[PDB]
Amino acid sequence: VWRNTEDEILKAAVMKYGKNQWSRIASLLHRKSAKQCKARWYEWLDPSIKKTEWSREEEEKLLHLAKLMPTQWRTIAPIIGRTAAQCLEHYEFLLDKAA
């Protein structure tokens, strides 16, 4: 997995190099590739991603969408503004709290 220490070194690298030079950023870290550095930045570390709690507008959206386009989370996600992994876990969450 990723540790606070890698994460902060990534944040600093990206903030110096920019978001298209993943190969030198991957050279800066040990046990990390450019594929993985990129995935981490665009999944969790990007300050555009929001980690708050769901407005119930957002949750009525999530439910309506996840019924209209079933199993299509990378397509659902941008229509509501969080990553596909967050949408998906929180959706299962509402489902089991409702079950």
Partner 1 sequence: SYECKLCLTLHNNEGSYLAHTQGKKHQTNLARRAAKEAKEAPV
Q: Is 49 in the site for partner 1 (CB under 8 A)?
A: no
Select the binding partner of residue 23 from partner 1, RNA, none (C-beta < 5 to 8 A, by kind): RNA
Put residue 49 in one of left, alpha, beta given phi > 0 → left and psi -120 to 50 → alpha: beta
**Which of 1, 4, 70, 96 forms a contact with partner 1 (CB under 8 A)?**
4
How many residues belong to the site for RNA (CB under 7 A)?
8
In this complex, which beta carbon is closest to RNA, that of residue 19 or of residue 74? 19
Q: For residue 10, which of 94, 83, 27, 66 has the smallest C-alpha distance?
A: 27
Residue 92 found at the interface with partner 1 (CB under 8 A): no
Q: Is 41 in the site for partner 1 (CB under 8 A)?
A: no
Between CA 97 and CA 17 the distance in angstroms is 44
